[PDB]
Symmetry: D2
């Protein structure tokens, strides 16, 4: 079937990619970076994030695989020594798929984005003020550095550094965390992270300034004349190729406690 391989760009990743293409040539496997059914990322979690966004319009027709040439990643969880074994078991089709939920982001002035990790909103300097509306009722007026809405698999990333909980990716949900909120008699926020199920809509609305720094995964965009930022669990999902058991809590333990 059609496949493609993206590389971090260093020597180790480029030549592991060239070796996998060589092994793939020994099978009924055609290299196509326009309509691949298999997308292989060689590098780190950042390389995988780029691969996901490179093919975000054909998610339902693509199985992703991540190979880490450096340390273990949460998406690049395959060791380079297993690269040759990846080729055969994947040419035969000896694999099922696991799917992780995604975060849908709507920005109105309208544009929509999908996030694999998180989407954040920050000020164009100093602190900013936004009204947080949950399912069309006002929840809080936030003043601080920013807010972060994370996918389940994204909770080990920016969300973790902001004090959020780590969620197993089988839970279809999204998590909101605060960035240095000021809490006093005037401004009052919940403080705790909030975990939302599907079909719940979190809306951020501007108060004074309407220019915000909006990020989706590794991409950071300055948006102007923004009227609303809406978050909800996407109906779409990213599909991974599964060849072996590597549980989420194992990857958490191996990444943060010790390998």
């Amino acid at each position: 079937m059609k496949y493609m391989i993206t590389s971090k760009g260093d020597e180790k990743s480029d030549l592991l990619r060239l070796n996998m293409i060589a092994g793939f040539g020994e099978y009924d496997m055609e290299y196509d970076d326009v309509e691949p059914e298999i997308v292989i990322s060689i590098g780190g979690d950042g390389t995988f994030l780029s691969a996901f966004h490179q093919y975000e319009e054909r998610l339902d027709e693509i199985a992703f695989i991540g190979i880490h040439t450096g340390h273990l990643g949460f998406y690049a969880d395959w060791r380079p020594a297993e690269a040759d074994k990846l080729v055969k078991l994947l040419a035969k089709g000896e694999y099922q798929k696991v799917s992780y939920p995604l975060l849908k982001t709507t920005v109105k002035y309208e544009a929509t984005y999908l996030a694999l990790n998180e989407s954040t909103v920050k000020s164009s300097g100093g602190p900013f003020v936004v009204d947080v509306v949950i399912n069309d009722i006002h929840f809080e007026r936030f003043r601080g550095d920013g807010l972060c809405m994370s996918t389940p698999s994204g909770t080990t990333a920016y969300n973790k550094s902001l004090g959020g909980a780590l969620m197993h990716p089988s839970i279809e949900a999204m998590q909101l965390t605060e960035m240095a909120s000021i809490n006093n008699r005037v401004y009052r926020t919940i403080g705790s992270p909030l975990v939302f199920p599907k079909h719940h809509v979190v809306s951020l609305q501007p108060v004074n300034d309407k220019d915000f720094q909006i990020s989706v995964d590794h991409l950071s965009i300055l948006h102007r004349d923004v009227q609303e930022i809406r978050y909800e669990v996407s109906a779409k999902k990213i599909h991974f190729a599964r060849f072996r058991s590597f549980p989420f809590w194992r990857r958490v333990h191996d990444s943060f406690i010790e390998d």
Copy 2:
């Protein structure tokens, strides 16, 4: 149908209970505290917690209602002024039910318990050491004051004070938080709260001392010769009587931000 009413025990709650019994007498409603189909708690969230444990063996056949004679509670979310309206709409059967997940706790020396809020494990003095095992693999060796496993509706209680996330109760899950863990080159814990889906089993195992203070909701028990404490989302659920929309995030906003 058969009903019963428990009271906090103060003057205001006892006489609101006596007035509801009087109004119930004006309907085909029989008072029975052995096999009630409707359990009404008048007081606070603590009174409701007692009512839940008083009838935890007939959960599948009971609809709970909470009335707060003091401030708003997350379970006692009905105001005493609406007590008379509660009687009629509930004698007619003009209500459906909403169900919140529960936490199952197994203590082996074997005893099982259900928690509506959380279950905690603490030392018999100073810090304690337990091995945390997730789905039969060792995750961490915890040294500190204790651990807390919370239901979704329990996240606004002890879990919130421990830095956990607030989870909407439609998510069938459980959340684990740490109590003052010591983190150094020797002892290493994740720090972040952990949210587990159904069918995931978290096991706490003793290292040196085998005597622990184990709590389930408001009840605190000292347990000796404990070999294991296992947590997982229960197959059982608590059923509430629903007469009106009072969203979980509204109760969060009203309780912690302002009413």
Copy 3:
């Protein structure tokens, strides 16, 4: 003696300022905004911060007074109703002085700055990497959103929202807090806030990018070709006019717990 009054710029502050000038005209008090011995700020803590920086080159010859036309401030701790009483007791010289420590910031490419609240260092987009050196020995390699070095009186401001401790201003010290650090096997930071005595020097050194967003109190500057940012408790101090006992912990209680 020579005095001056700065105003927030709203109607209430401008006309309280005009009334104080009128009352001052009834005394041997000359209005001079070039060499005042008394600087009165009418508005909020932000107005006071501007007044401090407006006269930061004559700190040793100026006594500051803060009046809050809105809610209570930590520097604007005088109520507008006591404005007329402020005039007389201050024309007579019936007051001593209290002094709060300041933070010295040296930026090398060299420029020096004084902060009454704090000084922060942030990235020009995403996370940044700086080496933290304490008294000429490498302490940690920080990767995250930023760092914040606070004065004692500044601990109730940005420092508080970052999890720092509240320090009584009689302690000559500075406090460093982290902004969403990533902690893993690669990058390791202390996490806890750090409190430094006098004569201790904290140096931030660039790793890759050398362009940082450096802030000192309300002013935020983008600095390029930065080689080092050094922090230490300043030898200079800000001097307040003291007419009455208003303890620091009282202002903390009144501001954050309830007035």
Copy 4:
């Protein structure tokens, strides 16, 4: 001069102690565990804590030295390989002294205690309620698991696990941290850690139950009919023998970041 050596009690510590006594016998050094001028602890920080409390009535006449037979300690900061060098430089008197502040604790029913690390107050089950009074004015009504008042050198211990700041021991101060406080419309606490200078008195006062678990360093005592617990920086100080530069921030880096 008169000296004594305490041991953790394991094989390695007992025989390093026997070797140091042998080396001391080769000098004008008399072993006396009643009036020693030099107290040597061999083991861990816990062994040193016991040695400090064993001789807390002769602090002004004793210089302490800590040797760690396991990992590096903040008090046991001497490696066993340097034991023989410790003997000579210390028989000659080729050393000055450094002094760390201590915490004074007064319990009234009256008893006084000195803490090298911290003193904590906890409930006899569940949460407890105490009024916090700072310098004779009511600061907050705390409801939660407990409170912790730490010395500067104690901030790397229980205080660190509770979110407190790390303070250099040259600062004469004490730091208070909270243990899982409940914060709502009813109960309101500051949340942030509080750092107090000398001569400031923090008083904890009972509300309902008057039975508390009071700890001072490694000793935990249940106290009954307690009317008040008062904390302030002690006028006394512990004196260390100084043979070489080992800065506090180096010990922090070596203990928590990497050795």
